[PDB]
Write a protein that binds this ligand. Structure first.
Ligand code: HEM
Ligand SMILES: [Cl-]
Ligand SMILES: [Zn+2]
Ligand SMILES: [Zn+2]
Length: 123
């Protein structure tokens, strides 16, 4: 195997096998890195300015890069596995026009990640 690379994943509605409304805001694929004996994923979101916070498996995002022009950011999370489901949280805050009409949105959600990374890279 390889201790770094890309991995496919999907974001599911919490504790279901259904695609989350959140899923479109997550760029695919992510990357993974194994370092200091631990496993990490590096996930890029779009509409970054709408997503005020993220955590996975109880760990808050560590923002490693931002692209202000594309309204994207890349966040690193420690994970217990590269293949399988891990619950996470996302905070969303929107206050701007949608189709010309003011829209406001302020929610904190649970989500379930399904990671489809390699099975031969252990912690
Ligand atoms: C204009 C933008 C958006 C609209 C109109 C919208 C609308 C909705 C609606 C109607 C629900 C169902 C709530 C319920 O029935 O209780 C929902 C749930 C949800 N939304 Fe939002 N949403 C928007 C943006 C976002 C964004 C940017 C994210 C995250 C990046 C997000 C993440 C979620 C999550 C995680 C749920 C819970 C159910 C699921 O996982 O699909 N939404 N949204
Ligand atoms: Cl979490
Ligand atoms: Zn809030
Ligand atoms: Zn809410």
């Amino acid at each position: 195997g390889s201790d770094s690379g890309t991995l496919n994943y999907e974001v599911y509605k919490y504790n279901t096998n259904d695609t989350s409304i959140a899923n479109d805001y997550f760029n695919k694929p992510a990357k993974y890195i194994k370092k200091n004996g631990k496993l990490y994923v590096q996930i890029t979101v779009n509409h970054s300015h709408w997503i005020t916070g993220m955590s996975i498996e109880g760990h808050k995002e560590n923002i490693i890069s931002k692209n202000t022009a594309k309204d994207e950011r890349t966040s690193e999370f420690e994970v217990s596995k590269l293949n399988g489901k891990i619950d996470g949280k996302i905070d969303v805050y929107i206050d701007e026009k949608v189709n010309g009409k003011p829209f406001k949105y302020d929610h904190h959600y649970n989500i379930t990640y399904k990671f489809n990374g390699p099975t031969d890279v252990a912690g």
